[PDB]
A paper describes a structure:
Sulfur, essential to many biomolecules such as sulfur-containing amino acids and cofactors including iron-sulfur cluster, is usually mobilized from cysteine by the pyridoxal 5′-phosphate- (PLP-) dependent enzyme of cysteine desulfurase (CDS). We determined the crystal structures of CDS from Thermococcus onnurineus NA1 (ToCDS), which include native internal aldimine (NAT), gem-diamine (GD) with alanine, internal aldimine structure with existing alanine (IAA), and internal aldimine with persulfide-bound Cys356 (PSF) structures. ToCDS belongs to class II CDS based on the primary and tertiary structures and showed the highest similarity with EcSufS. ToCDS is a PLP-dependent enzyme and the crystallographic snapshots of catalytic intermediates of ToCDS showed the conserved dihedral angle rotation of Schiff-base linkage relative to the PLP pyridine ring as shown in EcNifS_CsdB and XometC, which implies the PLP-dependent catalytic mechanism of ToCDS is well conserved.
In crystals II and III, three protomers of GD structure were determined, which showed the clear electron densities of PLP-bound alanine, PLP, and Schiff-base linkage bonds. The persulfide group was removed from substrate cysteine and transferred to Cys356. When we superimposed the ToCDS GD structure into the ToCDS NAT structure, the conformations of the PLP pyridine ring and His114 of both structures were well conserved. However, no tilting of the PLP pyridine ring and His114 was observed in ToCDS. The dihedral angle between the PLP pyridine ring and Schiff-base linkage bond with Lys216 (internal dihedral angle) in the ToCDS GD structure got wider than that in the ToCDS NAT structure by almost 20°. The dihedral angle between the PLP pyridine ring and the Schiff-base linkage with alanine (external dihedral angle) was found to be narrower than the inner dihedral angle. Two amino groups of Lys216 and product alanine had the similar distances of approximate 2.9 Å with the hydroxyl group in an equilateral triangle form. The internal dihedral angle of ToCDS changed from 45° in the NAT structure to 66° in the GD structure on average. In our understanding, the steric hindrance from the incoming substrate amino group of cysteine pushed away the Schiff-base linkage amino group of Lys216 without tilting the PLP pyridine ring due to the tight binding. In the GD structure, the distance between the alanine amino group and the alanine-attached PLP carbon atom decreased as the substrate approached the PLP keeping the same external dihedral angle.
Residue numbers in the entry:
A (entry chain B): -2 to 398
B (entry chain A): 2 to 398
């Protein structure tokens, strides 16, 4: 929408960008000043709880919290009522397992990918172990490319399919639209972990054939910490059983029992993170002013240069060689050095990078490595930063071992 | 300095008379500045990275957890961050759900906020348990002799420290001694006590304790606490698991890590925990003693002014047992209407059932209007309240 120069105009709103080269955006994003200003105005100018209390402050907070839910719903192509606020993606996913637990029978089958983050693996493991389910992993290569033929066989008799949109370890962008169409043809519930897609590329629930979808405010959306989202497609309102219950979730309560209210309030127990939802809505508004298409483009350029530069240094990097299937994340290793050491040297030069397993241990074991070092980007990162990154990589790479 | 020196830090204080503190508190500038510093100067995820931003974030996050532990007399590792009291309470029910057998007994009070009632109701329903209520009066002072009777066979006792509808301060020390004496696990809902009066887990004999940053502690929204006494680390099943929760993981198995990370699934509300820690620091600069005295002084004046006006108020007549909350009703007028006219005068009050329908149904009322305080509220505010209240009751001829 807005006429902005990328990345110069985003950088102007983010003071830390003058201090460091921030390449750890898959862990969490830097926060623009206008997102913190939107939260600061709730705290200082209209501080109150919601649930439509008659007083003016509650009226204004409530109106802002509702606005925030709608902004989020539009961003995803969802209806207002299908959006539920959690603390993070992890909560959202656990809520899907706990909320659907009751519909599984011994011998049922959950299928996922072998690349999942622990948060999109552990709930399904625990649930499988407890109810005697089968948990099967669709097959794929070491770059993260899934065998879609194997996907069709695995999904066939599946009760539920849970997949990440993008891998936080490898940067592979899975073909979630195709996987969703398969799940639909086979009558399997489809859950998408969009923790690394939201705010970096397009995420639309109807395009993705999603039944549930989860993402985290603090990542691509450029919101604060402490705010997540769980999309619950309306088809499921009659079966999903709210895992958290109490204030705000009812029509009536007596000492003998209770009656739940309509969604979305049905799923939101107690005072919500009002400030976080306002912040996330400002994050989303900020993203839409830049445009998801231009964000993707800017990340693809950074990925292209970084990658070409590491080939020149003969530094192996992971994930798909086809850049059309590679998000703004480049995991790499320097043979002869431990990832933690590479990240430490990079930190002494003011370049922030992550090292280790990335909460994706099955990725590291599949590939047969201890960790990787990971550089991740966002729209505010620059080609200039990548050049200076390559410059220190170059120096670092000198000497044997 | 009290309350002027606190009011200097809250701009809203110059725009309205905020008497809706039990719903949520107003937030002082230093709380917001602390959260802004994280977002603008050391923004990063926690867990562990070598990079400097992550070192700082990790350090401040841990520091927050310590500040919260010390606030309530706990051990660093016994503090779990959640989104609010309601999540904390639900997590207690879900993580202990496995220890009950059909016919076991859960005991609570009859004045509970829905968040400290429904999880127990649900659990009793699904497990064939006995859910029983200790008796009390309309004020609502609990019958402690009845509590002995009821806690005897109990597997778990859940009580609120203070009622958000009546303002009654329960005798939690005593109820806690009883349940310990009877071998029951004691769970305390301190949503309305944290930040308004002393809450120490040792003194309270609590096994589990819950509170909300956004209320008395003058912290932000989205940050709750659950206290888990070290005794229960091997019984309590973490209801939410994944990132930051493990030691190892493979495609068909997982090993969980140690408290408190074992109970915190995914990227935590870093900015909230840091905001909460600065609210607790702000609270301590003032002192819980002074906060409680300031609020008692407002209740006492408010209450006598409403007697003078023939406006009935609920909860304990004994002010020693009455927190900083006064629920009342104007005869001839629905509470939502009293709240509107008060709002027209820039006085913020809450009306309705306050998510405590069993309180309303025990008293035989639809709801009440609720004026609630904090340390920054003033005597001059209470007087202006009583003035519009007077005009309001006069007009009703
Ligand atoms: C977040 N992963 C990062 C913390 C990282 O790798 O550095 C993530 C989640 C969990 O999101 P939370 O907000 O709950 O921490 C889930 N799925 C994926 C793919 C990622 O990256
Ligand atoms: C919070 N009650 C207020 C919203 C009000 O009475 O208006 C409360 C809870 C729930 O805490 P949350 O932060 O989850 O909403 C639980 N117990 C009590 C006693 C209160 O007041």
């Amino acid at each position: 929408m807005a006429s902005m120069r990328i990345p110069e105009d985003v950088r102007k709103d983010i003071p830390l960008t003058n201090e460091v080269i921030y390449f750890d955006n898959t862990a969490t994003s830097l926060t623009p000043k206008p997102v913190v200003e939107a939260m600061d105005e709730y705290y200082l100018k209209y501080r109150a709880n919601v649930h439509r209390g008659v007083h003016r402050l509650s009226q204004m907070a409530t109106h802002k919290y509702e606005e925030s839910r709608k902004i989020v719903a539009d961003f995803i192509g969802a209806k207002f009522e299908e959006i539920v606020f959690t603390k993070n993606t992890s909560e959202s996913l656990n809520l899907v397992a706990l909320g659907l637990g009751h519909i599984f029978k011994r011998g049922d089958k959950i299928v996922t990918t072998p690349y999942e983050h622990h948060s999109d693996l552990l709930p399904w493991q625990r649930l499988a172990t407890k109810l005697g389910l089968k948990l099967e992993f669709i097959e794929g290569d070491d770059e993260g490319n899934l065998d879609l033929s194997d996907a069709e066989k695995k999904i066939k008799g599946a009760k539920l399919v849970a997949v990440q949109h993008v891998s936080n370890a490898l940067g592979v962008i899975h073909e979630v639209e195709e996987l969703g169409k398969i799940a639909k043809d086979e009558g399997a519930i489809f859950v998408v972990d969009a923790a690394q897609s939201a705010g970096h590329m397009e995420v639309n629930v109807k395009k993705l054939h999603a039944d549930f979808l989860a993402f985290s405010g603090h990542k691509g959306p450029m919101g604060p910490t402490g705010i997540g989202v769980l999309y619950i497609r309306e088809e499921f309102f009659d079966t999903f059983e709210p895992p958290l219950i109490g204030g705000g979730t009812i029509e009536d309560v007596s000492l003998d029992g209770y009656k739940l209210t309509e969604p979305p309030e049905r799923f939101e127990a107690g005072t919500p993170n009002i400030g976080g939802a306002i912040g996330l809505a400002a994050g989303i508004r900020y993203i839409e002013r830049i445009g998801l298409g231009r964000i993707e483009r800017q990340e693809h350029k950074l990925v292209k240069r970084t990658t070409e530069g590491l080939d020149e240094l003969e530094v192996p990097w992971y994930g798909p060689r086809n850049l059309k299937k590679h998000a703004g994340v480049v995991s790499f290793n320097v043979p002869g050095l431990h990832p933690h050491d590479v990240a430490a040297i990079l930190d002494d030069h003011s370049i922030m990078v992550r090292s280790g397993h990335h909460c994706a241990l099955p990725v590291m074991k599949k590939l047969g490595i201890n960790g990787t070092v990971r550089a991740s980007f966002h729209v505010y990162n620059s080609l200039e930063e990548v050049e200076t990154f390559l410059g220190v990589m170059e120096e670092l790479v000198k000497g044997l071992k």
